[PDB]
Design an enzyme around this catalytic site. Structure first.
Site, PDB file in Angstrom:
ATOM      1  N   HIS A   1       7.458  46.532 -42.596  1.00 17.01           N
ATOM      2  CA  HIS A   1       8.494  47.068 -43.472  1.00 17.01           C
ATOM      3  C   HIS A   1       8.614  46.190 -44.705  1.00 17.01           C
ATOM      4  CE1 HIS A   1      10.695  49.192 -39.919  1.00 17.01           C
ATOM      5  NE2 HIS A   1       9.694  49.907 -40.399  1.00 17.01           N
TER       6      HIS A   1
ATOM      7  N   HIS B   1      14.800  37.424 -34.997  1.00 14.47           N
ATOM      8  CA  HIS B   1      14.659  38.860 -34.753  1.00 14.47           C
ATOM      9  C   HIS B   1      13.272  39.365 -35.126  1.00 14.47           C
ATOM     10  CE1 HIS B   1      18.923  39.127 -33.978  1.00 14.47           C
ATOM     11  NE2 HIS B   1      19.202  38.621 -35.165  1.00 14.47           N
TER      12      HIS B   1
ATOM     13  N   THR C   1      16.980  49.652 -39.552  1.00 13.57           N
ATOM     14  CA  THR C   1      16.765  49.872 -38.129  1.00 13.57           C
ATOM     15  C   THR C   1      17.290  48.705 -37.305  1.00 13.57           C
ATOM     16  OG1 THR C   1      14.518  48.961 -38.215  1.00 13.57           O
ATOM     17  CG2 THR C   1      14.768  51.332 -38.542  1.00 13.57           C
ATOM     18  N   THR C   2      18.048  47.833 -37.959  1.00 14.50           N
ATOM     19  CA  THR C   2      18.662  46.693 -37.292  1.00 14.50           C
ATOM     20  C   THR C   2      20.098  46.651 -37.778  1.00 14.50           C
ATOM     21  OG1 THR C   2      18.152  45.175 -39.109  1.00 14.50           O
ATOM     22  CG2 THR C   2      16.545  45.326 -37.305  1.00 14.50           C
TER      23      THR C   2
ATOM     24  N   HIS D   1       8.857  42.295 -43.223  1.00 13.88           N
ATOM     25  CA  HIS D   1       8.889  41.789 -41.856  1.00 13.88           C
ATOM     26  C   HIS D   1       8.173  42.798 -40.971  1.00 13.88           C
ATOM     27  CE1 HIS D   1      12.357  44.471 -42.306  1.00 13.88           C
ATOM     28  NE2 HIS D   1      12.089  44.817 -41.060  1.00 13.88           N
TER      29      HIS D   1
HETATM   30 ZN   LIG Z   1      12.262  46.641 -40.151  1.00 14.28          ZN
END
Ligand SMILES: [Zn+2]
Ligand SMILES: [Zn+2]
Lengths: 260, 260
Positions: free
Chosen positions: A115, A64, A196-197, A89
């Protein structure tokens, strides 16, 4: 399973991950109408960010994004509770549309976004436990734009060709993570949001720095081309691009800023 | 049912309406990275738009927007097939954040947006049949911004209190619908997309006019505060605001312009 494009894309996350269709969702657009200066927002202090160069930190392609594991000894000081780091990440676009930041400012995307995730170590034993609990996480967001070469970000980018496929890992010698932060970190946007995931837990205290950092055209292109979300032996490779979530509705609320 | 907020909000539409999580979803951000000038995009002709003032047209509050039924007598000329009108409606934000258009231009939202929906009457007998079929719909989108009073749009706004609550209907004398279009209609963005509300069928040929129209602060405020999505006398009245979908990702440069 989930992705950023196709059948299992963001509009379908809520099917398996309820919180993705719930409250306090991130990211959001930061524009004048919903911004308010709060003189009480003091500077955060970054402790233990200068990681020992004699220690190695795991860089992984998790399918991801590219993630770097961080030690719990580095932490943020200045919030109601101590938040210890767990990982960092990135999010980016693609060569044809190099504007993949998650948060936007006045409707504008930045090239990418970093982030740095931390968890409430005062209330919880680890990030896994804190992730779905009240005041469980605090994330620092750095907006990235194309510009001058960045030696600090390259301490991460120079390893990209060794984590090209899902599940692959590489070791990054410790370096000063504060070097990845922009100028005047005292100036930032603050609001309560979510991961946000998936699972999109609304447990994140967001701090988005006002100023962006710069990385070169080459560094950005490398980030946008070196990674695949598929395993190396996969006969049909899939490029890891546009791994950012669209901005969410933000109504009846305000984002507070430490700057006027 | 579905809404623009809550557990039945847009992130959850795909749970009941598969196409909402499918391909070619609208609205989108009209920005350079995905635009392409095309000389084949000649001016459209709006025929039968001057509705007889001696005839009444149904205005309705369906709980999602204010909609005006249009006669199949009016149609767009200039496209491959003839598209006949079926209805028009609006999308808006709220007083504290008056930026509720669906499409954005260079990341910028406009105050509101007007959609004039048409169906392919050469291929299909009616809008319902055409809605989920190939080349079935064509929608004209007019971006709206706050500015000078607009007498033409008031020919609709003056009737808003008559359809204040969900389920209510009112009669609007015919007027020239072309008066709602902006200047230089020859200048527009063109792309293949979808309905921006469930079922989100990817059957819409979009024509978003480049130039916006203006309505006064008073008109915009009336639109943002005059309607409710709840029935008359509901114990918990809910204002109809922020009834627009967030922009969707749109990869490839498949957005064409009739201007340079
Ligand atoms: Zn993130
Ligand atoms: Zn519409």
């Amino acid at each position: 399973k989930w992705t950023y494009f196709g059948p299992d894309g963001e509009n379908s996350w809520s099917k398996k991950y309820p919180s993705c269709g719930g409250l306090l969702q991130s990211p959001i657009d930061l524009h004048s109408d919903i911004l308010q200066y709060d003189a009480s927002l003091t500077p955060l202090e970054f402790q233990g960010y200068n990681l020992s160069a004699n220690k190695q930190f795991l860089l992984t392609n998790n399918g991801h994004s590219v993630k770097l594991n961080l030690p719990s000894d580095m932490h943020i000081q200045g919030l109601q509770s101590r938040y210890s780091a767990t990982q960092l990440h990135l999010h980016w676009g693609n060569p044809n549309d190099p504007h993949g930041s998650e948060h936007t400012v006045s409707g504008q995307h930045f090239a990418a976004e970093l982030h740095i995730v931390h968890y409430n170590s005062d209330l919880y034993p680890d990030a896994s436990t804190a992730s779905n609990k009240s005041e469980g996480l605090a994330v620092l967001a750095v907006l990235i734009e194309m510009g001058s070469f960045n030696p600090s970000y390259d301490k991460i980018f120079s390893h990209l060709q060794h984590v090209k496929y899902k599940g692959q890992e590489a070791f990054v010698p410790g370096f000063n993570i504060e070097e990845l932060l922009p100028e005047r970190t005292a100036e930032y946007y603050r609001y309560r949001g979510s991961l946000t995931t998936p699972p999109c837990n609304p447990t994140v205290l967001w701090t988005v720095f006002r100023n962006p950092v710069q990385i070169s055209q080459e560094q950005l292109l490398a980030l946008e081309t070196a990674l695949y979300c598929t395993h190396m032996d996969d006969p049909s490779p899939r490029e890891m691009i546009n791994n950012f979530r669209q901005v969410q509705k933000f109504d009846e609320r305000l984002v507070y800023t430490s700057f006027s």
